[PDB]
């Protein structure tokens, strides 16, 4: 599944993604850490908060 960024988010650790409104995050997986997702943006994989994004359907 892919997700679309709806709200800007800045990474606070090196394993999170810095993401921007309109960007598509690819190959997105739900994680054990509740409220967090993992996917790929501009070649890099990291985690980002799920309420900044919306699942493309």
């Amino acid at each position: 599944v892919d997700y679309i960024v709806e709200y800007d988010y800045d990474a606070v650790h090196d394993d999170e993604l810095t993401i921007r409104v309109g960007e598509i995050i690819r190959n997105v997986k739900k994680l054990q850490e509740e409220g967090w997702l993992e996917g790929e943006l501009n070649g890099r994989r990291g985690m980002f908060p799920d309420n900044f994004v919306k699942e493309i359907k």
Binding site: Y9, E33, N51
Partner: peptide, 7 residues
């Protein structure tokens, strides 16, 4: 830990 950042 990781919070759940707020919109």
């Amino acid at each position: 830990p990781l919070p759940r950042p707020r919109v």
